[PDB]
Amino acid sequence: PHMFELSDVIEGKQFDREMLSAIFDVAREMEKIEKSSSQSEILKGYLMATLFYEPSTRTRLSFESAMKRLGGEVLTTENAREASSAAKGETLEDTIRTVEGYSDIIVMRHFESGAARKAAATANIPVINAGDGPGEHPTQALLDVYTIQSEIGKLDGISVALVGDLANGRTVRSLAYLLAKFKDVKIYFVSPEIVKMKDDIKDYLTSSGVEWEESSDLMEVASKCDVVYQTRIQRERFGERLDLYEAARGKFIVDKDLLGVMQKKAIIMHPLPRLDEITADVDADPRAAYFRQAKNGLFIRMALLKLLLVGW
Amino acid sequence: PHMFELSDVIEGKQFDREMLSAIFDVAREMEKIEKSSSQSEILKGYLMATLFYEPSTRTRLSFESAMKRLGGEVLTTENAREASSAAKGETLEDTIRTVEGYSDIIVMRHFESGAARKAAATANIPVINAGDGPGEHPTQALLDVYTIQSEIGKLDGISVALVGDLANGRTVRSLAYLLAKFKDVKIYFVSPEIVKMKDDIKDYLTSSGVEWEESSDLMEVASKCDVVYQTRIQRERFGERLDLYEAARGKFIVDKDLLGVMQKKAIIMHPLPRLDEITADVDADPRAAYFRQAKNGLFIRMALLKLLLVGW
Amino acid sequence: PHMFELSDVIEGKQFDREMLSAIFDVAREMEKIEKSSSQSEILKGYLMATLFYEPSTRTRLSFESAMKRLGGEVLTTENAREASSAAKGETLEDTIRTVEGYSDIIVMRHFESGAARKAAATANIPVINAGDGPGEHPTQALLDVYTIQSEIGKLDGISVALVGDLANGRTVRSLAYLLAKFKDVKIYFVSPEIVKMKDDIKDYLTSSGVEWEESSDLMEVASKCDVVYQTRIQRERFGERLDLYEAARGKFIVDKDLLGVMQKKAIIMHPLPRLDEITADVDADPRAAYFRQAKNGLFIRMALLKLLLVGW
Ligand SMILES: O=c1ccn([C@@H]2O[C@H](COP(=O)(O)O)[C@@H](O)[C@H]2O)c(=O)[nH]1
Ligand SMILES: O=c1ccn([C@@H]2O[C@H](COP(=O)(O)O)[C@@H](O)[C@H]2O)c(=O)[nH]1
Ligand SMILES: O=c1ccn([C@@H]2O[C@H](COP(=O)(O)O)[C@@H](O)[C@H]2O)c(=O)[nH]1
């Protein structure tokens, strides 16, 4: 029954193997509280400021539900740039120093990488990064790792297929970052060659002793795997190489014909939203875990709000 | 003290004479709870997800106030299409399966007819239709019928003038649908000939034994009526027929000179917002019931939230 | 323990010397409630409708936090013009008469001057003006005067520099209005000649016996002053007179070199947001009171919500 060791929750590089495992146990407690028929009061009298610079329905409501299930209450904007309707302009650090006067914890989604760290360094109240523009999405990585542990029973000695746009994929890079803190983890990188995982992750996995292999055969890798983690491939990542897009039509898709060839105890994960890269008919299969994934988000974020505001 | 018989509240064709009368009694209880000076706890620990695809201030706040007066709490978006700011696209069924993880009941206003039914069929939690685009607006019909019963004392043996754009009028069609489940109901259809009520409603009233009559004399019908239910007539419904618009200038208007000729116990109803089709000076008359109409909305929706979440 | 004497909070000309001093004492109580570790229940079961016609993050959250810290709850729109997504148009008085059915107090920010008074005159529930377009911003004036009293210990016998666009400056005019209700107040008007304070304020101060002096030397006035109240000067207020803009570059700026020359017990005030007219390095100085200003906003508005809803 002590202080949470992190002052703020900003970057994947803040969490070790022990910290993670300890947070996952808290999230299992959080799930018990959510399941209960009496309203929790753990965060009674605490207010959360949801500072979003852009609408992001799913993750905003995830955090706001999380606060409410613990007894706390929310302030919300998805128009953080509009600080006053009558006097134009907005400074991140000015917004933080104004809003911390109104609230006990800020959950921020800025448009610009590096914003979450500046907020943390400016605020006298805890800050959680909900999406630092195209940079760190820490709570999404933690809820990916939690779902795996949740659905598989272990993180040590697992095989995980990361599929789709790996070059530009923010959640596959930080999932891959976090898994490498466990033992006997094998990672498959399943993508067309031109959206293939970047070297900074390849050479960090190799420094971590994580085994890693590349493929463009999804069928082949799906059969050997605990976890198929799926992301779309936007057409625009192909540029003028339509021949390569036409080569890639059909092959990086989770559909019935890929469920056919998978272990019965494997899962399909997908941070959502999805385009056509998982057909609707995969939903009926108890191995489609992407909606249970989203639900783990509520627990993980209950956990984080709880550690940051009242401690272990 | 049993389960509410409807799993979801989607379409007018779900409610019979008995169900309605039973819901109206609950809404009279709900009004007592709202009038009380202690905060109700009936829905303590329940969360409502207000999933609106477009801003709709009045009906959104109506439902959100309703939840709060019963002790419950709200999640709210009027930007449901924007599921993530970083990964584009949104699937109705995916949105429902994500958000039901965060909430206990969804109140949805989609842009497309048929959306409310799909949500109900996808969700493992009750769903209320707040506006299925240009289709069913069930809670608005129920609050129209409730106001009539509320202000008139009876639904059996009443005369109700439905006035304005009847061809394209969603609330006049479903008001008319619902009234036909009562006895000795006479309906007047008061409109220019080119926005005159469509045949599917005319031939269902005639199958229900509801007496119905058409007119373009508002003055004439107002004098024989319990209820004048008023809707605007957008100029654009006239197309190139401006001669017909100029013919219609002044005659489909509730003003002092129409109050002059009405029973003292008749009421002016109007789902709002209004353009110029009810002059401001009608507001002072105790027969203008359109604001008491809006207030009945709060009760009816308290009722629905209450039946759906904790039963009769 | 009596009724609050104001039915609504709309205009600076509603508050005398006694009323202000009494409100400031309440706001000091409100600060004690906010500092407490148990959740206040003073406004339990009261709902506030935040009716904003335009996003205005800082003042909206200020009021909403205020309601929550007292135990009350909020309804919120920053899209008040959009009354229904399906039937276009909105009438201020219709919006008020609909929304008062859902709520116990309305906090309104309209786009048009005179809107707050009409709302007050239409509503059967208290109304607070959060910003009547380019007209009265009463709670901002009250939180300016409160900060001065809060940070200086007195309002009688003080010197206050009002700096920036005084011609067009809404908060400097109403700050200046309110200060003139105290004794031995000297006001400096520090600006370029073409955005110099207007005659209606100059001749009311002179009718109040308030001493007032104009300058374009900030350095000179800063040294003699309790309070430097700073506002930006938009380039566009110069029109084609760029020569005058180039003359004004650098001289109406609060930076270290102006802190150097000020009393140790003087304060920098600025309603925010700020452009470049206060360098970031002024923030470290304990005399920069603009963030403590914003925090006083929470107290003052707690006070107002409390007087209006449950009395002294
Ligand atoms: O096909 C997809 C869908 C989502 N995402 C990632 O998942 C995140 C989901 O978190 P949020 O945007 O909903 O907060 C997005 O930010 C984005 O990085 C992908 O990489 N690919
Ligand atoms: O002059 C009017 C005003 C409103 N409505 C109807 O009333 C509904 C009010 O419900 P809401 O849009 O406020 O939810 C609208 O959707 C629309 O069908 C009309 O038919 N005519
Ligand atoms: O440089 C500035 C910043 C703000 N304001 C005033 O301060 C108010 C702050 O209140 P709000 O717009 O945040 O409610 C604005 O409305 C505006 O009148 C200025 O005059 N100058």
Numbering used by the authors:
A (entry chain A), B (entry chain A), C (entry chain A): 79 to 390
Q: What's the publication's text?
A:
The mutation did not affect the solubility nor the oligomeric state of the protein, but changed the susceptibility of the enzyme to UMP, PALA, or to high concentrations of the substrates. ITC analysis failed to detect the binding of UMP to F161A, supporting the loss of inhibition by the nucleotide. It seems likely that removal of the F161 side chain destabilizes the inhibited conformation of the CP-loop, reducing the affinity for UMP, and thus, favoring the alternate CP- or PALA-bound conformation. To better understand the effect of the mutation, we determined the structure of F161A with UMP.
However, much remains unknown in plants about the unique organization, regulation, and localization of the enzymes required for de novo biosynthesis of pyrimidines, which are potential targets for crop improvement and weed control. This metabolic pathway starts in the chloroplast, where aspartate transcarbamoylase (ATC) catalyzes the condensation of carbamoyl aspartate from aspartate (Asp) and carbamoyl phosphate (CP)1,3. In general, ATCs consist of a catalytic homotrimer with three active sites in between the subunits that can be allosterically regulated by association with other proteins. Each subunit folds into two subdomains of similar size: an N-domain (aa 82–221 and 374–390) occupying the center of the trimer and holding the binding site for CP, and a C-domain (aa 222–373) bearing the Asp binding site.
